[PDB]
């Protein structure tokens, strides 16, 4: 069994092209990256305070 990855057949309707045109014209996938990174920022870190604390063994 297997599944494809790349193939998408993006529909060429007026509504669908609007979303693609909007995405290119007013960037939306890039702002998604900003949203993901900012959500990462507002999260406590995983760093360990060596030598005051050292990771598990």
């Amino acid at each position: 069994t297997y599944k494809f990855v790349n193939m998408r057949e993006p529909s060429m309707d007026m509504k669908s092209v609007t979303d693609r045109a909007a995405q290119t014209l007013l960037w939306t996938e890039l702002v998604r990256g900003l949203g993901m990174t900012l959500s990462y920022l507002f999260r406590e870190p995983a760093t360990i305070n060596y030598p005051f604390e050292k990771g598990p063994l």
């Binding site: 060429m12 092209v17 290119t24 014209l25």
Partner: protein, 83 residues
């Protein structure tokens, strides 16, 4: 009909940036021709005094020009005060 519809559909699907630029530039090229406020734009631009209002000699034959600056005669720009 179908020719322009497919072509515009084609352009916006591959090059949305290009058609947007042409639409805006093509739009901006025509508004001034039928603009209803450009007539005002020249009027207010001609109503801004940079130089001194040089007086002209008084000998009669010109009742149109006022005597005092507050006199009723002469051009009035109440439109300027309103728009």
């Amino acid at each position: 009909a179908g020719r322009i519809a497919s072509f515009l559909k084609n352009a916006w699907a591959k090059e949305p940036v290009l058609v947007a630029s042409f639409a805006i530039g093509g739009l901006a090229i025509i508004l001034p021709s039928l603009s209803p406020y450009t007539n005002y734009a020249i009027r207010i631009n001609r109503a801004t005094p940079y130089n001194y209002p040089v007086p002209l000699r008084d000998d009669g034959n010109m009742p149109d020009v006022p005597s005092h600056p507050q006199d009723p005669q002469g051009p009035s720009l109440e439109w300027l005060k309103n728009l």
